[PDB]
């Protein structure tokens, strides 16, 4: 049946859509579900055998789960203009997981949504640098560091699809 | 504090991002959360006062909830080529709610994800016609009807923010 991969809207938009595209020419024949849901729902679904694979930047409680570190990607603080300091902007919140972090004018889990809004909310937000570089009108905020996130695959250790999980994770995301 | 609006990834991508943009120049001062989550989580969150407003194409069980019909939008079956019949294509599944509907090669809740994938999966899928028209390389499948969905606002009838819900719903989405 369908192999389900779950992740936040921003991971699908910024990196997993390309990776999923490569799985259709991999040496096997599968149908896929690209599931977009909140972290607590996806983690519960792994335990209930309702989700096959979770991709995330933070490992959850690991009892009865397995994890594999896939890589690491850079994160920078972007705005729509050059030469701006953070105190001249509205800090918008793109969700990056519980451990990553005035009320923000906008909070969301979609990088594309926060990118569209940033140009009309005098905004800045933390975005994946590789994805942000191919957008127009993004400039790093001057008083800011380059940060990063790890990327993990999480699955049920006793999953009935451990064989297919092992082969899918041979295709690199980063 | 933040006013939370919840909807599927596809409603945010196809129509609610523009609507949210108009709320920042409305005659009031609010900060917003554009929440993307699965239907069962958003409905539970309304009941638990964790979500202020749900936008959806299908009314859930309505005990202790209120609803307002906002409008109706057309849905057509699109593929990447002119003059194709559905039996020449791979039918991909974009989620449209429990009542809307071979294993599909792809199933997702993001219209942008299914649009990117459609060009490499010989695919067709049901997309909002207004949004699809501004994309390049989409053509309606020849043997297919134009369908539609209603658009509803759902909220907790006894919400402590009924006043702000009433004013937000005065800004038209469609
Ligand atoms: Cl995730
Ligand atoms: Cl969810
Ligand atoms: Cl994540
Ligand atoms: Cl929805
Ligand atoms: Cl919906």
Numbering used by the authors:
A (entry chain A), B (entry chain A): 45 to 145, 156 to 228
Sentences from the paper on this structure:
Here, we report the deposition of 14 structures of enzymes from both the core and accessory genomes of sequence type 23 (ST23) K1 hypervirulent K. pneumoniae. Targets were selected using a shotgun approach aimed at uncharacterized metabolic proteins from ST23 K1 hypervirulent K. pneumoniae. In silico multilocus sequence typing of all K. pneumoniae isolates was completed using Kleborate. This analysis showed that 64 of the selected proteins are part of the K. pneumoniae core genome, defined as genes present in at least 95% of all strains; the other 132 proteins are part of the K. pneumoniae accessory genome and are overrepresented in the highly virulent hvKp clonal group CG23, which contains ST23 (7). Thus, the x-ray crystal structures presented here provide the basis for functional analysis of 12 uncharacterized proteins associated with high-risk K. pneumoniae infection.
In all, structures represent both metabolic proteins and possible transcriptional regulators.
